[PDB]
Amino acid sequence: PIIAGKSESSELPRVEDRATFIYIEHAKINRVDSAVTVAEAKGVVRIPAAMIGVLLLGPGTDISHRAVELLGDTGTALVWVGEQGVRYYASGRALARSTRFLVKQAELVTNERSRLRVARRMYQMRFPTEDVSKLTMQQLRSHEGARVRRKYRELSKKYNVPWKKRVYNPDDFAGGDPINQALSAAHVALYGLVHSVVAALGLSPGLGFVHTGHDRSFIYDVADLYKAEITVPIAFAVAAEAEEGQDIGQLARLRTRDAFVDGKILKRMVKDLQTLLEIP
Amino acid sequence: DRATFIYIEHAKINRVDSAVTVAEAKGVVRIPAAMIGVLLLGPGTDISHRAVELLGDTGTALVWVGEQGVRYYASGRALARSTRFLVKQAELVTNERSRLRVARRMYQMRPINQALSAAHVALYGLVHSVVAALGLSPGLGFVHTGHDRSFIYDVADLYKAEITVPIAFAVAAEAEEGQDIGQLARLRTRDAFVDGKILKRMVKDLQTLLEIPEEGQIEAEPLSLWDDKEKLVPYGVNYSE
Amino acid sequence: DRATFIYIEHAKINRVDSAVTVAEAKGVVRIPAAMIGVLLLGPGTDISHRAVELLGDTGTALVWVGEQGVRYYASGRALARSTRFLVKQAELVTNERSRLRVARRMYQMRPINQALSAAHVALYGLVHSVVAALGLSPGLGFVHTGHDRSFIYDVADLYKAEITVPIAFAVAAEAEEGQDIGQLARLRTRDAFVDGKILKRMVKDLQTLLEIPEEGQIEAEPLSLWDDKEKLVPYGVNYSE
Amino acid sequence: PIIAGKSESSELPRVEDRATFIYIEHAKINRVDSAVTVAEAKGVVRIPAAMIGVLLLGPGTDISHRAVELLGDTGTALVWVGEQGVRYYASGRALARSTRFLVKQAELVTNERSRLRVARRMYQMRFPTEDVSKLTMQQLRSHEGARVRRKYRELSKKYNVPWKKRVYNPDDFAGGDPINQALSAAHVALYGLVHSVVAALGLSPGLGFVHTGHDRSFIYDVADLYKAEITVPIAFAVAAEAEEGQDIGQLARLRTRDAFVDGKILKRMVKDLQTLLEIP
Amino acid sequence: MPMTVITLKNVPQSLRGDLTRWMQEIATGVYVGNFNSRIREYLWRRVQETMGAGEASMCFAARNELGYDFLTENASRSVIDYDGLPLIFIPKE
Amino acid sequence: MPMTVITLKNVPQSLRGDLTRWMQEIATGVYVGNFNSRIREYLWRRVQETMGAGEASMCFAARNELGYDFLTENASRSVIDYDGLPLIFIPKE
DNA sequence: GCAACCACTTGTGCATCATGAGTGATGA
DNA sequence: ACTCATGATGCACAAGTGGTTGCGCGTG
């Protein structure tokens, strides 16, 4: 029997058939009449949560408990994208009742040979012009960092924007420079999208391959593939384009959503998550 | 090796500097964020953004639950965003030898229909809350497999015959004709979960199953903000009314 | 060689056996189908399906017009499904010699601005109604070409400086501030058109321009229901009240 | 300015982008609140006139003067499809301002050589295999007549229905045979559609090539191309599939509309009309 | 994805808020959203059993000349098939 | 062809009847129709200059990741873009 | 005669407010 | 402290009903 607020997985759009993200700030997420209602001071906005994968929470969002229950049931993940990086994640039950992807990921991460093979595949996806038949884990990480910094430098000289010889990380990345805010907004949008996709597919976010130690390691392992390809150039373009008085976060989020739509980042992400785990 | 399980309900959590603020009808409770451990945000909770910012800054596992953890609704990162339980569980479930060993360990450790069903669902909710707090994955199950919560089923199988059955029999004896039985079963199960000993048993069993060394194991302390204020006053928990 | 152009307004038309039944407020009229040549249906008219079928069986042209034919809205088949006028017009407009000859014959026979424009629009409506009754194509014009209503403009240019101008001048003379000049111009134009001599001259000029022989020409009969009751009674038109 | 009840040709869909026809019987087409309304006894139906090319009027139908004006302005043509074929035609001002098509048609119909050549093109489109490069008017007309009789006979044999050696002609064709009623319904729909298209494009319905004498000669000429291709086989299929005590006209019209949609008869009709006048 | 439109009135507030999770609400009672056949069918089935004693009407893309079809459940304005062409019929009291 | 939905209230009866010529009416003030872009813009321009003092909301298919866009004129439920994504905003008293 | 306009009544159902009832959505 | 359900009370808008005015839509 259909009950308002509770829906089966089939009544919900697939992961690749829904929108990307919504950013909410200075509001009060609430559930009235079984509708996820954002109670902004001026008025109320009801979210079509079934069409959205992840929901971003900015500064001042007082979210209730039935709102989180409804969002988790819908499949929309919750991420608290505050200032200077992502502060907290949240996710309900997975949209998939089968754990073939999860068990395959566990098998691949429990084995050192499979771990190195998956790391090689990730590196090949990020940089397909190299040969990685004889690289090691530490070498892979060093090369990954080296050409991530190189791509940062290339985009810094391309768009004529100062950069203080740094690489973005969700942990303690802050600054008054608009480039810092643009990078933070684009990257938190990407991380929230990756977290929502991983949660919906049933994958465990803590069974990472390149990154280990924290329960969001796989989120980093899937987000870094598209970090330098789309989100970093988008943030640099936003920093170049942004003028005085422009909200860097809002414009950066708009541009990164435009690039996510244009690049088909989420369908590509699902295809990648299928290819790395090697399901025929 | 301490993991406090502060269960919140009927409140609004906001943050004063390095201190959450639980404002129930009884009064305002201020807790140092360094001692939260696991937060079980129950119904009627308006968790703020600054509060979750501070809680996630200190590795607090926020799990949105119902009446004393009857149902699991959502969860955040784990205790100190730890992966040791998750990685250990994955390693033990992947290869056949450790999976069989863990299954054998589980076997060694281990109206009326409606009452049983409601009790089982409540136990599933509490087990899922504990698992998502610790960091384990609900899908990587040993005896049960292929489902999103197979591990939750496998863990609740330990307490099937010693928690849910007595509560269901009590409900059936106390049941009145023309009344819904699932409601009474869930209420009695949450009443049983009030004390917190069951949560301690679940944490201990979860940490024992994965062969975590006893030296490195952490114990569960299901604090109560107002019932256990004596144990909280010297720890820095201010109280207001 | 006789065509009666009976104008119906503020009435319903239905068929009983073989004669249409006008049901105006003044009374009920029973014109036989064969008597009607072209029915100029006006405002406030509910033409029925049986009446349309009967009129189309006897080759009657149903033209939906305004008050006294000031505006042309829609039309049916031609008078007795006649194409000879249309064929002759097409032949005379196709080649350059006949086009030039017919145009030369046209010129040989050939507030204030608002009234003039309204009068021209009403004249266009009447010309279009007559043309649709006879079966000519408004597109195939001699002086004017490149518009779907060019021949209507060409035929109305015959009466442009003889009918519309005096009416517009009279309207402009008898006018005051705050009055809709177009309304007065259209009302005066329909007052001029109710006589029927203009329509007879229009039909005769149509055949003359088409170079139709005088033997084969058809003379128009702008009949009326109650204004010409004495003329309609001997021809079998019943009158009721 | 914009006035309710009036619309320019640009605000209207193209002729080939509209629905084909709609049939109305035992009702009262009326204009209330500037909408074409069909006042049935038990209720009222508003006609989406701007999406319908021709309107079919059945027995016991009353239509008001303002309703006719509104339908004509909208571009929908009026055809009185009673029993025994089409009883009457009606149309308003065309929505094609330029008269290039009409002038070309007049030039093509004035020259006897042009008439013969365009009749050759129509016969070629109706029957492409045969070669008629050296045929005259009588030879042509007799040849299409024989081909139509042959098509009628073979289609009757295909569906195993009795045919009393007849050919449809709106000039006094009456019959109570269910096959006769079905083919009459299909044909009246076809003639109404042809009249609507011809009126919409600015062509004169009286300038025919094969048929001549009556004001709708061009309508018959254009309907010759399509009457044997689709309408006759669909009418025969309707007659064969008819069951006892069934409204043959309704199902015949439904199948005629389905055939018109499947065969793209409207875009095909406008393309054939454009090619017939040799308009590049 | 073909567009889907659902209009509601005199229905429980639960459904009125529940549909806002799938499609938005441009005006009171009317909801618009782009789905596929399966999602739209499931959502119409949900509306069927939650509307209770109300009125519901659905519009969605179809394969007719107009290009859309209507589904109504105990709605005032029924749909009458004019030979494969769906039109809205308004019964008179 | 994309499906266009126009919702009207507090508008003259003339517009209510007139807009039915192009696109049907499945509920009181709720209209549905399939047009191309140009026909839809012309119809919206007609709606703007005929409603006088009233509420008009139009929903059409677009190229954002939701699949639709809203354009409203003097409507209560204004539309606010949530970083390139259209959402319905219902102001309070 | 038809159709728009306007004024007047009738009435339906949405939106609001204050109070009491729950913590719910129920599978090895 | 939340959310839902519910009984009020207020209300804004559509519906039918009764006359009244006009035949209208205005470039070649």
Author numbering:
A (entry chain F), D (entry chain C): 4 to 283
B (entry chain E), C (entry chain B): 20 to 129, 181 to 311
E (entry chain D), F (entry chain A): 1 to 93
From the paper:
CRISPR–Cas adaptive immune systems capture DNA fragments from invading mobile genetic elements and integrate them into the host genome to provide a template for RNA-guided immunity. Here we reconstitute CRISPR sequence capture, processing and integration by a naturally occurring Megasphaera NM10-related Cas2 and DEDDh fusion protein (Cas2/DEDDh) in complex with Cas1 (Cas1–Cas2/DEDDh). The natural Cas1–Cas2/exonuclease fusion (trimmer-integrase) catalyses coordinated DNA capture, trimming and integration. The Megasphaera Cas1–Cas2 retains the canonical heterohexameric architecture, with two Cas1 dimers (denoted Cas1 and Cas1′, a or b subunit) bridged by a central Cas2 dimer.
A 23 bp duplex sits on the top of the complex, while 5-nucleotide single-stranded 3′ overhangs extend into the clefts formed at opposite Cas1 interfaces. The DEDDh domain could not be resolved in the PAM-absent dataset, presumably due to a high degree of conformational flexibility conferred by the 38 amino acid linker between DEDDh and Cas2, and because all 3′ ends are buried within the complex, protected from exonuclease activity. Dual Cas1 His29 histidyl residues measure out a 23 bp DNA duplex by π-stacking with the terminal base pairs of the double-stranded region, clasping the prespacer strands and marking the start of the single-stranded 3′ overhang. When the PAM is absent, the substrates are fully trimmed, underscoring the necessity of sequence-specific interactions for asymmetric trimming and PAM protection. Loop 7, helix 7 and the C-terminal cap are absent in the PAM-deficient density, suggesting that these structural motifs participate in PAM protection.
